Design a protein around this nucleic acid. Structure first.
Lengths: 123, 130, 97
RNA sequence: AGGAGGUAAAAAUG
RNA sequence: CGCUUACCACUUUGUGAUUCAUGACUGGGGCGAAGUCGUAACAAGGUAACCGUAGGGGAACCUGCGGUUGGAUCACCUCCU
RNA sequence: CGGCCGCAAGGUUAAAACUCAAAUGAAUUGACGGGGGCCCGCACAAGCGGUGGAGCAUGUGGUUUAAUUCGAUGCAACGCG
RNA sequence: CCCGCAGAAGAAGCACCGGCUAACUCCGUGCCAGCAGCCGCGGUAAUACGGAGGGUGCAAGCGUUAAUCGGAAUUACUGGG
């Protein structure tokens, strides 16, 4: 027990690290989305995945994978982001939401159509 | 391939001004033969390179592009001409080397070893329900 | 200042001959559309470039200086020639400048 | 069965 | 009323502490890539290795000093009782 | 990094960002040792007759050519298909 | 709030289906396009990528993201080494 060592050094309520260094408790953040590129994944896979660096409006210069098909962004193209990582590209811990003021969705993705901010086809 | 130095005569203004340094009274009276260049950007003619010779910073060329080379080593005016004529070639052609490098790099022999590998790890994920 | 020209010589072989590598059964018999060239050595580029490129262990060349370049990653022959020609532009000046 | 003593040469790399 | 002493906020100035961004350039770390050459380390890895300290060196590392086992190896041949 | 100590090399105290989803302990198994034991085989020792040297027949490589068909090409290919 | 008209008329989509964790086949492209919280799926026969059929969960709400707690006896006085 060593209660005398505990009466001096208390039980440390260890604060864990955050997986989202954007801002405190922010659901989303607006990014200046700069320098579009496409790089290769790690040992699990191999592909040509479209990604983009994010100049954040809170000051950060982070990276984010572009999960989608339709390329509706360029040099600037200020978009929004949602948390979460891809687990296959060493370095990215964000996602480019396909439903921002700037970035729209991709057409004809019927199965689970709310994905990629795709507008539901009434046809 | 076919290399013959042009450097247009009647297009280059050569200015002979006095020198600098030590050496007695000889160096300050008849050392005006020393040369200083004058190569304006208006005598370009490649249309794309001369502006790339002006934008990228380097010496011998100011903020306007009137390229000057004040050569102070020789005693004759003759040697000042050719020595200053070589550096103009040695600056411009050296700086116009805008390397058409290339790219890229995409794994082509990684996935001939990486591919069979992970699929063989499927037996590693069989430690469960049957 | 010094007019340097990267002019295409006439002493180079533009012959649509066999490609070199793999590809199943088409690579062993027919093999067309790949510009495998030869830059005849005893010709122009007046001795300054000829033996200058020969005193260097290099790929895609002969032992005599009749440079054999392979142009593979292009679909049309207009671009395959560009793959062959543009390589030689960079290739000879690589062992020159 | 205990016990003492004696005994031997180098040779790299996939 | 007017004048004046003392106290005081603000401002200005001199000289420091501390803290936050940014800084050409430069070093160390990780990752992918795995192009290069090495094949250290692991069977005693073909020189057993690890720790501390010092020097050397293109790289893994090498060598001297001391310590630990988180290291091996114990047959025949000759002879004797 | 700062503090402290030291002549110096450094020592002590002691983080973070970032990055991976593994790192590690125990004992189990095959393999190798110029490791040992025990044991076998023309392995050696004890002898006999051959190859290699000469010519000839045949096969392969290399070379050459309009083609010298192709495959096998350490033991276990080369009088092989 | 009550009485009458009252054509079912005007009133259902969202996620997911390899396992974790309820639910299956086919087609198209071939470690390419892409998916995911974790292990991972995709090398011309994909129950994991895209679509279609069907199914499961929930419901005027359903998923995603972020934050707190429990899970976590991974700060253990209760209650660890």
């Amino acid at each position: 027990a060593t209660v005398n060592q505990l009466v001096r050094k208390p039980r440390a309520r260890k604060v864990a690290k955050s997986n989202v260094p954007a801002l405190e408790a922010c659901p989303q953040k607006r990014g200046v989305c700069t320098r579009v590129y496409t790089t290769t994944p790690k040992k699990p896979n191999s592909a040509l995945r479209k990604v983009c660096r994010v100049r954040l409006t809170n000051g950060f210069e982070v990276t984010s994978y572009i999960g989608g098909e339709g390329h509706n962004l360029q040099e600037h193209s200020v978009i929004l982001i949602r948390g979460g990582r891809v687990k296959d590209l060493p370095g990215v811990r964000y996602h480019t939401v396909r439903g921002a003021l700037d970035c729209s969705g991709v057409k004809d993705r019927k199965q689970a159509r709310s994905k990629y901010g795709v507008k539901r086809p009434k046809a | 391939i076919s290399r013959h130095v042009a450097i247009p005569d009647g297009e280059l203004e050569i200015t002979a001004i006095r020198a600098q340094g030590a050496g007695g009274q000889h160096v300050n009276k008849t050392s005006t033969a020393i040369h200083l260049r004058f190569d304006i950007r208006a005598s370009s003619l490649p249309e794309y390179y001369k502006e790339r010779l002006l934008a990228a910073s380097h010496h011998l060329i100011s903020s306007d592009g009137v390229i000057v080379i004040k050569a102070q080593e020789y005693r004759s005016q003759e040697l000042n001409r050719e020595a200053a004529l070589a550096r103009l070639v040695a600056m411009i052609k050296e700086l116009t080397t805008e390397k058409k490098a290339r790219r890229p790099t995409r794994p082509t022999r990684a996935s001939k070893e990486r591919r069979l590998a992970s699929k063989a790890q499927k037996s590693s994920v069989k430690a469960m329900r049957g």
